[PDB]
């Protein structure tokens, strides 16, 4: 349930939030909603044990 | 009234001030606006 964002286009200004979950792309080929090659979901899990 | 944000309708939370002769509704939520933002009267 506890998630973090590891990929973003730019640095974040103070006291702002980013709730939207979209497919992040770091290349020329668009993801188009498919988490395939060069496509990563930004919300990653901690996984505490 | 005034509208602030990055995009509209969804995908980004948007500031929203609506003024009238009675109150002021400032509200940072998603909401629904079309491509022609206007307030209907009747």
From Swiss-Prot, chain A:
Changing residue 47 to S: In strain: Omicron/BA.1. Residues 1-49 are annotated as: Receptor-binding motif. Residues 6-41 are annotated as: Disordered. Changing residue 44 to Y: Reduced host ACE2-binding affinity in vitro. Residues 1-7 are annotated as: Immunodominant HLA epitope recognized by the CD8+. It comes from the Viruses. Changing residue 4 to F: Decreased HLA binding to NF9 epitope. Increased binding affinity to human ACE2. Disulfide bonds join 31-39. Changing residue 34 to A: Increased resistance to neutralizing antibodies. Binds to host ACE2. RBD also interacts with the N-linked glycan on 'Asn-90' of ACE2. Cleavage of S generates a polybasic C-terminal sequence on S1 that binds to host Neuropilin-1 (NRP1) and Neuropilin-2 (NRP2) receptors. Interacts with host integrin alpha-5/beta-1 (ITGA5:ITGB1) and with ACE2 in complex with integrin alpha-5/beta-1 (ITGA5:ITGB1). May interact via cytoplasmic c-terminus with M protein. May interact (via N-terminus) with host bilirubin and biliverdin, thereby preventing antibody binding to the SARS-CoV-2 spike NTD via an allosteric mechanism. Attaches the virion to the cell membrane by interacting with host receptor, initiating the infection. The major receptor is host ACE2. When S2/S2' has been cleaved, binding to the receptor triggers direct fusion at the cell membrane. When S2/S2' has not been cleaved, binding to the receptor results in internalization of the virus by endocytosis using host TFRC and GRM2 and leading to fusion of the virion membrane with the host endosomal membrane. Alternatively, may use NRP1/NRP2 and integrin as entry receptors. This is Spike protein S1. It comes from Severe acute respiratory syndrome coronavirus 2.
UniProtKB/Swiss-Prot annotation, chain B:
Glycans are attached at residue 20. It comes from the Viruses. Attaches the virion to the cell membrane by interacting with host receptor, initiating the infection. The major receptor is host ACE2. When S2/S2' has been cleaved, binding to the receptor triggers direct fusion at the cell membrane. When S2/S2' has not been cleaved, binding to the receptor results in internalization of the virus by endocytosis using host TFRC and GRM2 and leading to fusion of the virion membrane with the host endosomal membrane. Alternatively, may use NRP1/NRP2 and integrin as entry receptors. Binds to host ACE2. RBD also interacts with the N-linked glycan on 'Asn-90' of ACE2. Cleavage of S generates a polybasic C-terminal sequence on S1 that binds to host Neuropilin-1 (NRP1) and Neuropilin-2 (NRP2) receptors. Interacts with host integrin alpha-5/beta-1 (ITGA5:ITGB1) and with ACE2 in complex with integrin alpha-5/beta-1 (ITGA5:ITGB1). May interact via cytoplasmic c-terminus with M protein. May interact (via N-terminus) with host bilirubin and biliverdin, thereby preventing antibody binding to the SARS-CoV-2 spike NTD via an allosteric mechanism. This is Spike protein S1. It comes from Severe acute respiratory syndrome coronavirus 2. The chain holds residues 103 to 145 of 1273 of the full protein.
């Amino acid at each position: 349930n506890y998630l973090y964002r590891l990929l973003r286009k730019s640095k974040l200004k103070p006291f702002e939030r980013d709730i939207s979950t979209e497919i992040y792309q770091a290349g020329n080929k668009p993801c188009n909603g498919v988490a395939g090659p060069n496509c990563y979901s930004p919300l990653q899990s901690y996984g505490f044990r | 009234g005034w509208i602030f944000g990055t995009t509209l309708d969804s995908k980004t939370q948007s500031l929203l001030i609506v003024n009238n002769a009675t109150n002021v509704v400032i509200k940072v939520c998603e909401f629904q606006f079309c491509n022609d933002p206007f307030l209907d009267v009747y």
